[PDB]
Amino acid sequence: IVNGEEAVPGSWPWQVSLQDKTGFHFCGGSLINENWVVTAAHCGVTTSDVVVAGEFDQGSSSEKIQKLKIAKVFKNSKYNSLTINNDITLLKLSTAASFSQTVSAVCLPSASDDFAAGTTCVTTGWGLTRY
């Protein structure tokens, strides 16, 4: 996030980090319950990647996190790799996340919810702070 700010640690407890088998962060995601993460289809997640829950400081080797294996990847079959439309994938965890002060789920909208233009919303992540 460019021109964002540091979050209060643990205050976005659904935020997960998607990492390869060496620990390299390539995408974020959101817990929607103890067994499922929603992320983008273009992230290309496979069952060799892992879901890291409870993280704040990726440079702290001591921080207490849950590295969770992925049992199955459900890429929306209508994801359009040309137009980028329908850009969503679900990850089913092989072992449930253990919810806690720093790990819990985001709510999901109903299909009919109207979120008005101009509403102040928030986005979070470990992406670049400078391109």
Binding site: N3, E6, A7, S30, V38, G118, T123, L128, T129, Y131
Partner: protein, 97 residues
Amino acid sequence: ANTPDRLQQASLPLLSNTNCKKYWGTKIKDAMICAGASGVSSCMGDSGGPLVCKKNGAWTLVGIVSWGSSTCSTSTPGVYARVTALVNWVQQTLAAN
């Protein structure tokens, strides 16, 4: 550069489709929602993470970080997967699995 070690956040406004299309034109499709152009920008490593808005006091997933400016410009709209257009698929997938 390299990514920050510590989790970042930014507040930002949802944009109407009409205002988003003033920049991105017909690249904006029906399962996309735009936000930002407000001095902040999602950027590489943010993809797949949340865009949340409060609904009756509870943070609710409205977008998934998807794509945008190829240099993460903070004056152009960021584009997010529109979760209301995709949540029926989410619920069906959970129910079946």
